[PDB]
Structures are given as C-alpha cells and as structure tokens.
Amino acid sequence: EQDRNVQLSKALSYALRHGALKLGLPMRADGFVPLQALLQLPQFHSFSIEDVQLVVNTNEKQRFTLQPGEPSTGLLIRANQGHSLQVPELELTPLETPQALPLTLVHGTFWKHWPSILLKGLSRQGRTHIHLASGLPGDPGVISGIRPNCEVAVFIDGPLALTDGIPFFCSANGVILTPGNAEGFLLPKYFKEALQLRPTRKPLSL
Ligand SMILES: Nc1ncnc2c1ncn2[C@@H]1O[C@H](COP(=O)(O)OP(=O)(O)OC[C@H]2O[C@H](OP(=O)(O)O)[C@H](O)[C@@H]2O)[C@@H](O)[C@H]1O
Ligand SMILES: OC[C@@H](O)[C@@H](O)[C@H](O)[C@@H](O)CO
Ligand SMILES: OC[C@@H](O)[C@@H](O)[C@H](O)[C@@H](O)CO
C-alpha cells in the first residue's frame, strides 16, 4: 500500500506538473484539471477517488490541492508548485515586503551544479520557478521546497532581491518561488551566505 500511495503520488506529480498537455488533459491556466478526466487516463485506472483523497490528504510535502469544482465537473486537482507547464494563474500568495518573507530563505543544491550557480546565479532551469525553502531540511515548518539530500545550501538576501524588482511567492505547501529576473536567473548579487551540509555542516565562501 505504501508503494501504491507513493506510485500514485509520482504519477500525480508528473501529470499535474509536466505531462498534462502531452496526456491530453484539459488543464486550466490555474493548474487545476478535472479529477474525473485524469482518473480516466489508463495509468490511473487502478486508482479510486478515495485513493487520490488519501494521497492528497497525507503526502508529507502537501504537493496537491483537491477541491470541488463546477456542478457538472466534480473534483478539481492541481500540483501546488513545481510546474514545467505554463500555469500563470496558479494561486500563489505574493510576498512583496521584507515582512512577508521568511527570516531564512535558502536554496539546497549539489556540488555538481555549484560552479555553474556561482558563475551565473540560480536558474529556474526546466521549471517556472526557482524553488526556495524557509529553512534547512528538518527545520520547523519546512515541509517542502528543499531536497533532503542536498550537499550545499545558498542563502538568499530576500529584501535585496525585492528592492531590485525580483518577485517572490509562497505556494500552498509553503514553498517560496521566484521566476527570477528576465532570463530566469537569481543572480549571485543576492547570495547572502553558503553552507556545506554534507558530509558535515561547514561554512562555505561565496
Ligand atoms: N545556473 C545553474 N546551473 C546549473 N544548475 C543549476 C543552476 N541553477 C540552479 N541549478 C540547479 O538545477 C537543478 C534543477 O533541479 P529542479 O528543477 O528539480 O529544482 P529543485 O532541485 O529546486 O526542486 C524543486 C522542488 O522539487 C522538490 O519537491 P518535490 O519532492 O518534487 O515535491 C523540492 O521541494 C524542491 O524544492 C537544481 O539542483 C538547481 O540547484
Ligand atoms: O511524490 C511521491 C512521494 O515520494 C511520496 O512519498 C508521497 O509523499 C506519499 O507517498 C503520498 O502519501
Ligand atoms: O517537461 C519538461 C521536463 O519534464 C522538465 O523540464 C521539468 O521541468 C522537470 O525538470 C522534470 O523533472
């Protein structure tokens, strides 16, 4: 069962973040798709509505929102962040002042990307938003937004980037998102500090 819930969660992630258009799903600009249309895709034929409710209600990163739609349509489901698809109307809380930012704003990543990040800044890469978290893995209130196996973390100067015009958003599961600048980048001008997390915690020079 724990396999099937994980498997459903990964199939939901893929379809709702990346695959909807390739799959023929009628997904809205806000990232919602009728659950009934999704459950009629062959890869979902083994899952029930109760199965989907359970994965939505219990997945630790709160990846999904499930809500009632129009009378004819039934339940709607979306991924709360992480899209490569264009979902410009996805419901996000704008974070427009220093006060609305979390005190800690950090991106976890890996040695493989570290030289390129120091050179060009953080890039949204294949996704709509650079993903940031309000703490390191394990910290209070951090349910998503930073991978648990990260080797390095770069802390972001939220207020600086705000002054320079970079917009930030908070997703429903608490991920801080920024589209970056015009080219999809959070330039190194905004790197407050850096920290090695693996194998041990050690400071790192920017
Ligand atoms: N200039 C640059 N050059 C080279 N590499 C660069 C770079 N700039 C950044 N990178 C790195 O390019 C990779 C893209 O990788 P990704 O698209 O998966 O982004 P991410 O790792 O943040 O993951 C998103 C959420 O996904 C998970 O959530 P879930 O479990 O899926 O629900 C977590 O919550 C996560 O917050 C990352 O390593 C970047 O560090
Ligand atoms: O995206 C799959 C994830 O790895 C999974 O662990 C879910 O959090 C959980 O299985 C659903 O309840
Ligand atoms: O369809 C796009 C492709 O799947 C990739 O760009 C995603 O942005 C993401 O990186 C998937 O993990």
Swiss-Prot record:
EC number: 2.7.1.160
Catalytic activity from the UniProt record: 2'-phospho-[ligated tRNA] + NAD(+) = mature tRNA + ADP-alpha-D-ribose 1'',2''-cyclic phosphate + nicotinamide
Gene Ontology annotations of biological process type: tRNA splicing, via endonucleolytic cleavage and ligation
Enzyme class (EC, first level): transferase
Acetylation recorded as keyword: yes
Keyword Ribosomal protein: no
UniProt keyword annotations, A-Z: Acetylation, NAD, Transferase, tRNA processing
A Gene Ontology molecular function term of the record: tRNA 2'-phosphotransferase activity
Chain's role: Catalyzes the last step of tRNA splicing, the transfer of the splice junction 2'-phosphate from ligated tRNA to NAD to produce ADP-ribose 1''-2'' cyclic phosphate.
Similarity annotation: Belongs to the KptA/TPT1 family.
Protein name stated in the entry: tRNA 2'-phosphotransferase 1
Gene: Trpt1
